[PDB]
Amino acid sequence: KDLPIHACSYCGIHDPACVVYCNTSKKWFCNGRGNTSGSHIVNHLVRAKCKEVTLHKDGPLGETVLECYNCGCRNVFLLGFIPVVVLLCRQPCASQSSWQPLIQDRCFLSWLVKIPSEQEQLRARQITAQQINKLEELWKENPSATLEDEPQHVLLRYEDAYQYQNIFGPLVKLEADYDKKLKESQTQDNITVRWDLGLNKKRIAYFTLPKTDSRLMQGDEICLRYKGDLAPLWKGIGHVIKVPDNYGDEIAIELRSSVGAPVEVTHNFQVDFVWKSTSFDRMQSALKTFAVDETSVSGYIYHKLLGHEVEDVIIKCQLPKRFTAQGLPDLNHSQVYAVKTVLQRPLSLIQGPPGTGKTVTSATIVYHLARQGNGPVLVCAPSNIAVDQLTEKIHQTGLKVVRLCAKSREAIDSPVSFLALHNQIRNMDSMPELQKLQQLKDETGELSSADEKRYRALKRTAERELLMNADVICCTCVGAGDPRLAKMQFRSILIDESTQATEPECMVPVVLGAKQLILVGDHCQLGPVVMCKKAAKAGLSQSLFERLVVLGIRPIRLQVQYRMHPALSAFPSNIFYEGSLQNGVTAADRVKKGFDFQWPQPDKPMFFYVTQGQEEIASSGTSYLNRTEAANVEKITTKLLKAGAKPDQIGIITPYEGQRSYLVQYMQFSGSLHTKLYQEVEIASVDAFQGREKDFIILSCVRANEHQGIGFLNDPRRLNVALTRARYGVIIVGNPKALSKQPLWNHLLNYYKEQKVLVEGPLNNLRESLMQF
Ligand SMILES: [Zn+2]
Ligand SMILES: [Zn+2]
Ligand SMILES: [Zn+2]
């Protein structure tokens, strides 16, 4: 929804008491001066060459054309009051033969047209006098135009949410367009399908694509077309329920509609990846409302987000007697500090380094916010796993939590699916008619118009009730722009993994009425992914959290790590956290009991295992693999399991789909242990381990030739995530020469070598490598 029709055509102000409608130009202007020395009407009347004026319906005087009571002269520069008061022309009507100027000090009398307060004007578009000239110069022959007549780089500080929209807006468009072409380039042509039937009795299609790195996500939408000649032309939409993983390389989709699926036929399918504008629209719209709607975020948040100087404000509030939340672990001192500081200000950042209890700290905050009783607390993060991790912790506190997701993500199971709004509505025994309708619906996918109408009516009632009555609503950043949440307000908002969102993404939940906003994350960890290189270079890949940091806002840092053996945290702490991370567990706490595995350096549970075999490209696709390297990864995996580790306590991180896929196949084929044990060893790229941990982590670097690389190979931040998932042991497998083409990896290899932990030869008889860097 735009500005009201009575919005000042210059700065946006739309308080009916402060506006003046210009009869010739048919436009409204405000009685405030803003950036110039003189009001916005007066400045306009002068340059547009006008004099005739009508006041607003809801104004001190009502909807009336200003004119002299004597002669009806409508010239405002000639009008004025004589003292029980009369409006008269200075000459000759004020002349005693038949005084106060109406315009005085370059604007209208305050008690006929009110002057907007500083706040309103400080919130309006900051239009300069030199900008008025040019804008007013264009209206001359184009009364339609506005101020907008290689993309402009992101800034630290913004005059305006309007300037803000104008800078990020075109960045979002570059991303959306890029993404559309990307998605559309992905079409696969000669595809073989395996058909199946879920227990929910929906139709499922399995198929295998070339091996690619980009990624495909559960709940993504795929258009499956039959194009063979064993039958006729058929098209179906489905949503991804399986990506290639430890159970094999197949992608699986669940069809929306069961009906008419060509189950009998197998060859000649075409796979298209449906693009939707939704997330970009929601981003564009959040920019719009950030500019246009002054109730969408508080004055404080508004000025703070835009890089203005604001005096500190203490949020009034009753502190809990105890900061630790029921259901959750006792907080340490720095976490207690974070919770208490954060509750007492309108805006905060919290930095949660690996192993420091970011998630528990966020859940505890949310918990106290929810008990202050201001309606549902809004909680977001940029990714589905990070929302789910947060949802789960918050649930431990005993609060009513609703997890909201897209209708496309509905087929997806997670540990928190039982909390999903669509599942909760399904269990509403207070609503039998809705339940009956929902049964009917679960035979086809669809309903009759009279019933689909009824069902939508009831489903809306059911969604209002669970959403309005929740203590906490968890959803994705982009998901906060869901139409089911519009018409709701959220005064308290916590965004975790905010360091993974672009500014526009982050702002989507922000504009839903923020009065208190907490951004949690870690800018030394995962950042936003921006596919469009132009957009990237203009700044889009800088999260909101990062910009506020560079702007000089100090994040409260969580200080104690409880995950890692001290030897494992040393290097990331020294590199990313200026050696400030404190160890909450000892070396002794982090020696696995009866785990008889021989570390090269027995008291340092890490090593870099040198291999220098050749990388190759996948036989089907464009990703990389390393066969030498994979054999070694299995041997290590097998040693760890034989020494006492359990498959779910081990993770393998590699940047390439080629290597992931090869590793699963290789272990199933050549692993000496029972095949299923390997199936339970998670192999994936670094994204899938965010917020998660294992006892042991193996990295498989893959590349043996100098390269740009992807994931942890050329992003120090992803390397930081890779090095901090393990509690007990980290093993890196790879080729040092290929990797030392990197300041960081260079430092990592020097470090490991000084630590005597850069090694070669058979696992049974490891020697220190003689290479140097
Ligand atoms: Zn104005
Ligand atoms: Zn005019
Ligand atoms: Zn007159």
Distance 22 CA to ligand 2 centre (A): 4
Q: Residue 347: left (phi > 0), alpha (psi -120 to 50), or beta?
A: beta
Domain edge (last residue) among 561, 596, 627: 561
| 760 and 617 belong to one structural domain | yes
Distance 74 CA to ligand 3 centre (A): 8
Contact, 184 vs 203, CB < 8 A?
no
The experimental resolution of this structure, in angstroms, equals 2.5
Q: What's the angle, vertex CA 203, arms to CA 225 and CA 440, rounded to 5?
A: 120
Domain edge (last residue) among 545, 561, 577: 561
Distance of CA 596 to the CA centre of its chain: 43
User: Does 30 count as an annotated binding residue?
Assistant: yes
Which residues hold their Cβ within 5 A of ligand 2, which is an ion? 22, 24-25, 48, 50
> Distance between CA 351 and CA 211 in Å, rounded?
36
Expressed as residue numbers, the domain containing 440 is 416-469
User: Does 8 count as an annotated binding residue?
Assistant: yes
**Separation in Å, CA 426 to CA 104, 437, 548, 624, 674:** 66, 11, 42, 45, 41
Contact, 511 vs 297, CB < 8 A?
yes
> Distance between CA 223 and CA 234 in Å, rounded?
10
User: Does 525 count as an annotated binding residue?
Assistant: yes
Distance 27 CA to ligand 3 centre (A): 25
> Phi and psi (nearest 5°) for 568?
-80, -30
| b/e sequence 624-653, b meaning 16+ C-beta within 10 Å | bbbeebbbbbbbbbbebbeeebebebbbbb
Distance of CA 583 to the CA centre of its chain: 30
Element (H, E) at 251: strand 251-255
- Is the bond into 101 cis (omega within 30 degrees of 0)? no
Distance 10 CA to ligand 2 centre (A): 12
| 499 and 450 belong to one structural domain | no
Q: Give the 3-state DSSP-derived string for 508-529, with helices as H, strands as E and coil as C.
A: HHHCCCECEEEEEECCCCCCCC
Contacts 24+ apart (CB under 8 A), 60-64: 60/17, 60/111, 60/112, 60/113, 60/114, 61/112
> Distance between CA 120 and CA 97 in Å, rounded?
44
| 380 and 509 belong to one structural domain | yes
Domain edge (last residue) among 561, 593, 623: 561
What CATH number has the domain bearing residue 250? 2.40.30.230
Kindly calculate the radius of gyration of the chain based on its CA atoms and give it in whole angstroms.
32
**Separation in Å, CA 411 to CA 242, 393, 408, 731:** 11, 23, 7, 36
| 536 and 617 belong to one structural domain | no
Distance 293 CA to ligand 3 centre (A): 41
| 386 and 482 belong to one structural domain | yes
**Separation in Å, CA 499 to CA 316, 344, 541, 553, 708:** 28, 22, 10, 14, 24
Return the ligand number nearest the Cα of 82: 3
What CATH number has the domain bearing residue 502? 3.40.50.300
Q: Give the 3-state DSSP-derived string for 341-354, with helices as H, strands as E and coil as C.
A: HHHCCCEEEEECCC
Q: What total of structural domains would you count in the chain?
A: 5
Element (H, E) at 743: helix 743-754
What CATH number has the domain bearing residue 442? 6.10.140.1240
User: Does 68 count as an annotated binding residue?
Assistant: yes
Contact, 6 vs 16, CB < 8 A?
yes
| 367 and 325 belong to one structural domain | yes
Contact, 613 vs 627, CB < 8 A?
yes
Element (H, E) at 730: strand 726-734
| 622 and 746 belong to one structural domain | yes
| 362 and 411 belong to one structural domain | yes
Enumerate residues 6+ apart whose C-beta is below 8 A from 273.
183, 184, 186, 187, 220, 221, 222, 223
Burial (CB count <10 Å: 0-12, 13-18, 19+), residue 132: buried
Distance 78 CA to ligand 3 centre (A): 8
| 46 and 176 belong to one structural domain | no
| 135 and 154 belong to one structural domain | no
User: Does 89 count as an annotated binding residue?
Assistant: yes
| 481 and 585 belong to one structural domain | no
Distance 58 CA to ligand 1 centre (A): 18
At what angle are helices 566-576 and 743-754 packed, to 10 degrees?
A: 140
| 200 and 300 belong to one structural domain | no
User: Does 562 count as an annotated binding residue?
Assistant: yes
Give the technique used to solve this structure: X-ray
